[PDB]
Structure formats: C-alpha cells, structure tokens
Amino acid sequence: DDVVTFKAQEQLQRASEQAHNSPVLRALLAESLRLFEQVAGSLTPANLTTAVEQYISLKYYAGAIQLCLTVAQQKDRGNTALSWVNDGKPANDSRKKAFDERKICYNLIHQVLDKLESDFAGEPELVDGRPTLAATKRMEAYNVVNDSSDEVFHFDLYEWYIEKGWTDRILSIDSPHVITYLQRLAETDFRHAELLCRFYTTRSRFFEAAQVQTNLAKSDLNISLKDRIILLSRAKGNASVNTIGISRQQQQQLNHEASELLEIAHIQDDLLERLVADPRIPEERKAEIEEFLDGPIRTLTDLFNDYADQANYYDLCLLIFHAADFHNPRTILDTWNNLINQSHFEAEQRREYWEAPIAEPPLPYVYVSQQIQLIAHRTSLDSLIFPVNSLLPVVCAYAINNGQDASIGADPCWPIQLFLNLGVPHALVVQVLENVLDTQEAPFTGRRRKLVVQWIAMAVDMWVREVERRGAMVMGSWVSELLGRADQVLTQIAGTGAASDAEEIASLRRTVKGLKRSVD
Amino acid sequence: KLVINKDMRTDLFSPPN
C-alpha cells in the first residue's frame, strides 16, 4: 500500500503549495496592491502598516516592498529628502517631514526583508533541477529593492545593511548609488573607508583604492601610525599595477606620494620605537611622546628637533637627512663621525661588562660595521649621506685610532671589505685609497701606511678578480702608477723600521708587484 | 622640507613644569 500512501502525501504536499499556485490570490493580491498604489500619497501610516502586515501573512513580500516605495515617492515627489541628505543633515528644517515620513515606509521594508529570511530561513535554494518557490519569492523581493530609483531609500537601506553587519551584501551590489553613500561616510568613519576600498579592489579599480588608502593615512581620523604604514604600503601596491583607464604619470604621481610618506612613517615609527625603550628618557615624558608620535605622520622638522637630534640618535638623523634631501656635506659628515664614535663606545661598554651581556657581544668594529650597513641598505648608497669620498677615510682612520686590527683578531682590511661588499664600485674605493696613500694626513702617516697598502693590495686584488670573471680588458695606467708608487712606501717603511714585521713587509711587496703585472 | 631650530625646543630629559 505504498502507492496509496504516496498519493496521500501528494495531495497534502499539493495543498500546502496550493495557496501559491492559485491564480485567484495572485489576482486578488495584485488588485489590492493596484488600489493601494492609487491612494499611495494619502495613506496613513496606520493603514500602510496593517497592509504590509497582511501582505506578509500571505507571503506577498516583493509586492509589499513596492507599495512602501510607492507611498514614499508619492509623499515627497519633489524629492526633498534627497536635497536634505545631499546637503547633509540640515537641522531645524521643514524637510524633516519628507525624511521622517519616507522612513516610516522604509522601516516597513526592513520588516519585510527580515520576515522574508525568517519564513524561508535555511530553506533550500534549488529544488532538484529547479528553484524553490521560497527562492522565487526571495528573488522577486530583492529585485524590487535593488532596481528602485529612490536612492534616499538605498542610503537608508545601506545604513541598515551595515547596521546589521551584512558586509558581503554591500560589496555584491552592482548599483552605482552605493559608491556615493560610502564616499560621504568613508571621510568620517574608518570602518566605512574599509568598504569603499574593498569595493574598488573587487572591481580592480586599484588606483581608486590607493587614492583612498593614501588619503586616509593623511587624515585627521584616529588611526594608529603602524596601521597608517599598512595603508600607505598597500596603496603603493595598488598604485604599482595598471588599472583600466588611468594614466602612467598620475599612477606614478600617487606611488611617489605614498612612498614619500611611507619613508617618513618608518622613520617616525623607528624613532618612537627607540624613544620609549630608551633608559635615558624620563618615564613621564615617554607618555607625552607616544601620544604625539603615534597617530598622524608629523613633519621631518618635528621628528628631528624635539627628539632625534636631542637624543643624539645619529643614525636616524642621517635617515632624516636623506628623506629631506638635506644638502650639507659638513653636518652630514659630522654626524657620521659621532655615529661611529658613539657606536664604538657602546660596543666597548658591552665587551667590558662581559669580562648585562647575554651572549659574547660583538667587537667594536663589528658593531660599527652593522650600523653602517643598516644606513647603506636603508637609503640605497646615496651620494650625499653616504659620501665614500669622505666617509671611507673616516672609517679607515677609526680602524687605526681605536686599534681594530689583527691585534684583536680582526681582519685588518675590514674597512675595505665593508664598503666593497656594500656594493661600492671597486674603481672608487681604490680611487680613495690612492688619495689616502699620498696626502699622508694623520693618522695615515709613518709606518701605519703599511696598512694603507694592505687595503690597496686587497682592494685592487678584489678588482682584478671581478674583471677576469666580468670579461673586460676605469682601470688603466693610473692603477699601475699607484701600485709602483705604493711599492716605494713599503721600502721606505722597511728601512726606517730597522721592526719585527720586516718579513711581513717583504711578503707584501711580492703581492703588490704581482698585481702590477696583472694590470700592465 | 626640513628646518633645524636648536633655539626653542622642549627638554627631552625632564617632565613638564
């Protein structure tokens, strides 16, 4: 008797579906709606409510929405609620009637779209091979909403989508009325600028995203500095790739602005990062600092004076100079000398305490070498704040005046190895050691010039190694002129030394005269 | 741009009056 049972379940399943298959209802309901839309502009809020309540009882969702939209438009046909919100919240106004009346209708639309999901909550989206009737009344409903020309309703709807946390709904909307809403809101709420930027990037309008991401870091909004760094770092990414329609010059114009601010913001961050963790600063001032630094990005003037220059943060002072295109060879160099000395000082401090130091601390020249590499890699070997013409001699002078050599087990040629490995051109290092070997300005005097030759011997050695591999054969007579002139220095030092290195010197001559052959 | 002004600053090593 399973056959008789199926026919019993069939009639019941058909009885439930009946109310919707019926063409009488579809005709009655459509007729009641037609009559309401006639006197739409004269409906009392009490009647419009009762009507929507009854329409929902009968699963007439999409139609009830169309009544409320119609009563809205017909209560203010001149569209004053647009002129009200578009001008933006004119308080003490007669156009509060338009919005207040239109919203009584909009609140009912929300009621429908809520009861819509409730009745057909979790119900299936697709009958085997066909959409459900639940999904049809759903499709009918959200077609009325998204197609409407009443955009004040769309704004009130978008405000209510957000207030309900329906994020993915805003993004999925293909209307162009939503972008106007987010713009008016992104400028005063960070939570909304997030959407406007996420809307643009799904459309692949990356420039329009970086355009907002950048303008947000420059904002007066309560945003952390490290977040502002992210914004400017994403904007530089969104402004790195082509987007349909936008030029190359305006694209680079925005990438450059983002890169400028990002460079400062990293300085400001690394400054704030060090200032708070600096034991020399009073704990009371540190609270006043972070409130001033964390937040918007300040001028390089503010970063430099009240903080970086006082604390004698010579490394960040140089980074500020680079970011400010600060043309002054003296102050740039004076800061490099202080940076090296203060670095040598701290590193001799830690080694003395390790004689608290956690692990074997680094020798002075190692720590000084790190502090240089950090500025070389961060600023890309500028010709201004990294002037090899002056800085390399200073490092070579410090390597003598503070005895960072074989005496402590250090590579005597560590100042050359430092600049070569940093990317400095071989031809330039030798061009400096040439100037050091002749002038004989202290400390580069007397028998210590023996070490100047060592620097030249390896420098030129590291250069002939690079050209054999390079495949070339600027190096010329002038390098041979130097090695032969550097040979006289080794003999003039071998005589006045009559020293125990008399055999070390002799061994170097056999290396020099060999390099001269490789060049000639 | 950068503008050094060693004249009038705020003492970085003391709390405020």
UniProtKB/Swiss-Prot annotation, chain A:
Cellular compartments annotated: Nucleus, Nuclear pore complex; Nucleus membrane
Family according to the record: Belongs to the non-repetitive/WGA-negative nucleoporin family.
Quaternary structure and partners: Component of the nuclear pore complex (NPC). NPC constitutes the exclusive means of nucleocytoplasmic transport. NPCs allow the passive diffusion of ions and small molecules and the active, nuclear transport receptor-mediated bidirectional transport of macromolecules such as proteins, RNAs, ribonucleoparticles (RNPs), and ribosomal subunits across the nuclear envelope. Due to its 8-fold rotational symmetry, all subunits are present with 8 copies or multiples thereof. Part of a tetrameric NUP192-NUP170-NIC96-NUP53 or NUP188-NUP170-NIC96-NUP53 module.
Function of the protein: Functions as a component of the nuclear pore complex (NPC). NPC components, collectively referred to as nucleoporins (NUPs), can play the role of both NPC structural components and of docking or interaction partners for transiently associated nuclear transport factors. NUP170 probably plays an important role in NPC assembly and organization.
Entry protein name: Nucleoporin NUP170
Provenance organism: Chaetomium thermophilum (strain DSM 1495 / CBS 144.50 / IMI 039719)
UniProtKB/Swiss-Prot annotation, chain B:
Span of the signal peptide: none
Cellular localisation: Nucleus, Nuclear pore complex; Nucleus membrane
Species the sequence originates in: Chaetomium thermophilum (strain DSM 1495 / CBS 144.50 / IMI 039719) (Thermochaetoides thermophila)
Residue range from the parent sequence: 732 to 748 of 1793
Membrane topology: Peripheral membrane protein
Gene name tied to this protein: NUP145
Name of the molecule in the record: Nucleoporin NUP145N
